[PDB]
């Protein structure tokens, strides 16, 4: 039963990659995440077993809210609706809760209200190249960036206006590669990751040590 | 009529028309790595003396044959193994003796301890070739690592009269004096370590106590003969 | 989308429901199943296995092997009762904790016949006759060997046979299934009497013992699984 | 009609095996249960009629919440979302509400919000052996443990942050063996269970007693 | 509308679910796939690639290339052990971080055989004999060349062959799959002994080095993906 | 999943509805039906039976 060691069964697992909070009375109460696979070390190491990858994206959002302190004699906030906007690479990006970018028709968005099943959206392989690259030995100049790996950005905000009390919401983004194809195996990462942007490392031993060659 | 059965360099005699109980309708067979046929021989353990006050005897299977020839040698040599058994139980009694025995082979006969918080030690759970005896009294809780050997619970917290669910044969002295139980290999894994796990436990419990008149022999010997069947162990060479 | 309507009971959790459920570990791949001896497909296979009946309850005996031993000895006067118990498999006490009784106490309704086996465990030189009588429900228990003989009975000669097997009949209120537990209802009894004394030679013990075995004989069935009353 | 006495109809019944509570303002407000069939005496006795068993697991969770005392002038908590994580044998285990183990991608988890149908997950036969063992006459040393019966652990916690008042939730776990196969019948347990970990017993009478052998 | 009923678990998010999801960018049209060399379909293809084993852990060596070098030199007395390590691919330390070990540490259960290759990297004029012994699980490690020879072994003549390949057998508790990690369990060892001294001509260095390679040989398999313990 | 739309009256309980319902006791097995004399299929069979008229109310 070698089926569980296939590329699909190895990489097609949902994982929480990003976590953020946003309140509804700040003008800045919006969460953003540039989609990248280097956020989580465990997922980064599993993807870096290969050089070139091609996969689809399935995103599931777990949004929960919590009541913040207020002075109102009575608070009776209705059900909250949230907007999750996906900005494709090169699309307009918001800087405030009230911004035109939130209404761009070419920026697909999901409107979801609390109490239902969590929202879910899928993004396909959107690179002008033929595959994503986990390693790039060259310059774009910055070494090893390869801007052909841009996957877009996600934005989240409250749709409802603020009522008689603030509401703070937290969003958990779940990331799942689908229909994955991998090329050019590479040695597993041995040194601890130091920076999210580069492969920099501090030299470490090859393995754990024993007392002598004869144990 | 008497039938003589020879296995290897050992031979025993049985009544030709003796009834054999096959464990679960399955004969011992080979795993569908390394077999041994020099083990295919009868191992006659020491006879025990059935008396008026006898409560019962039991033997854990792998352990009982741990100090017997090549089978024990194979047990310490190989790490893993599996085997079936053929158990012969014979009583030597006259027509002036009366009594009834239950001869039952219990798979995975996990036993309780007199102290409710602990577990029995290996010495109390098995005596190897020596037999372990049940007790018609209840072992006190003060005892720390002994088996609760009250017969009516059979050391398993069950009704002793319900042990007939396991492959068994009755020995009624007025009718018959021998029992033959063929036990296949029963485990949750194809092979197991023989030194840390007793697959089978043979039990002999007198339901009707032995009785006789003055002048008759005050004992009835019980002889247990075990012949491993289709034994095989793990290989020890390279590929 | 396709128009749908939710009927009553749509989001409910009924503990007896049978619905497809999502697998928490898809792509796990389970260890292949092996052929283990002694596969069980029905509890009634357990119910049809003979087990020893503790006829001699006699609280001084329930904590010993004497609970299963029915004493038999040479008595001066004849016609005494050897033993007797109601034929209630699941409520009485003698058949409560046997293999048949334990299975029955997991259900509320049951049907079928009871197979009773008696084994004489005296010396091979002992001889005698026993009268095993079955009283149908409604009819009272016999008070004498004569009354037992006038009813349904079997004369058991231990000098010729060591075991006797009786299959008591179903006989129920055209109910097919009847309650495992019961309330002051016609029960039906099985009793044993000394037809003759136990004849024994010199140097042979006259006092012997009898073992009783029970099991389901005919088309036994159960219904309405429940909780067993034997657990706390 | 002997259909109701089959192994499937005898064991395939949902039963409440575990019950626990957890609040959302404690750091320790998480419920755990090691999956074992010895928790409930009635289910233990029914499974111990046999020596070896093979079955799938169906789990249904009944989660309810109750408002705890607070001093806030007004409490308007939104709908609560709960996380139920199944940790396979050998997987990482949490010790706090905020712990990495909650985000392990190989630990399947269910995110469920109150008001909907109760969540349900199924675990298959996950033993390296060919069957589970209800009895083991040997050592692993501890007598009669058989670590091949490990079935994993379940963990439960609030996803929402604490609001203006504490919320205490209780979870009822419902356990149902599916596609059960049993081997080697055994005598029904007669003595009362004394310990959950072992078969230890205190000697008891064979049956109830009457006055005399002739009633 | 059509009558429907929602079963338990209808609005839940199970992280292992496999459901159709709406596409955020329908009508995008993806770049066609090209033929890139080195397509990988299974991690076991990586597991079957030979990699250098750091036999000489020797913490003064783990931060150098000496970790892979097994020293061999002409010793006055014969029969010393050259090296030895337990055959635990995923827990020990020598096989932990190899290509095979890294893949294994992503799973909880594994099955199959280990292929060990030893390469002599001395001069072409050096000659000698080495005894490579395999100890099955349960059996203790050999203490002498004689004990090693009496067990499973191969006599390796560096004067005739520069490499020797051993495929250690599976041998597990009829479990088919066994745990990648382990606890004080029978391990099985591989050890090397000086059958003869290293014979060398004039102007040739007697001190040499041996390289060890590991890989999966027979039908290797893994189960129950998990988190690797090597990341923080 | 498959796209669906809930029409008005989806979660309502109409006392005259005719919908499949879950069985609380699956795997029970009912007592087989016997032939009882006097089976009634319609109330009009009762309506066609002669009965005595209380003409003298009085």
Residue numbers in the entry:
A (entry chain 1), D (entry chain 1): 58 to 197, 203 to 277
B (entry chain 2): 12 to 43, 54 to 260
C (entry chain 3), E (entry chain 3): 1 to 232
F (entry chain 3): 1 to 58
Could you give the paper's own sentences about this structure?
Mature CVB1 virions, like other enteroviruses, have 4 structural proteins termed viral protein 1–4 (VP1–4). They form an icosahedrally-symmetric capsid of about 30 nm in diameter with VP1 around the 5-fold, VP2 on the sides of the 2-fold and alternating VP2 and VP3 around 3-fold symmetry axes. Similar to empty particles, recombinantly produced Virus-Like Particles (VLPs) closely mimic the structure of infectious virions but lack genetic material.
Through cryoEM and single-particle image processing, two distinct particle populations were separated. These particle populations were termed compact and expanded, structurally corresponding to mature native CVB1 virions and CVB1 A-particles respectively. Particle distribution is 48–52% in favor of the expanded particles. There is no density corresponding to VP4 of VP0 in the expanded CVB1-VLPTween80 structure and no significant unmodeled density which would suggest a flexible region. Residues on the VP3 loop are rotated away from the pore on the side of the 2-fold, potentially not blocking the VP1 N-terminus exit from the capsid. Unmodelled density shown at threshold of 1.5 σ above mean on the sides of the 2-fold outside the capsid could be flexible VP1 N-terminus. At the current resolution, an ion coordinated between three D203 at the 3-fold can be observed in both expanded and compact forms. In the expanded CVB1-VLPsTween80, a forked density is present above cysteins which could be additional ion densities and in the compact CVB1-VLPTween80 two conformations of VP3 R232 are resolved. Here we observed two structural differences of CVB1-VLPsTween80 compared to native CVB1 which are the presence of a VP3 loop in the pore of the expanded CVB1-VLPsTween80 and an additional density in the interprotomer pocket of compact CVB1-VLPTween80.
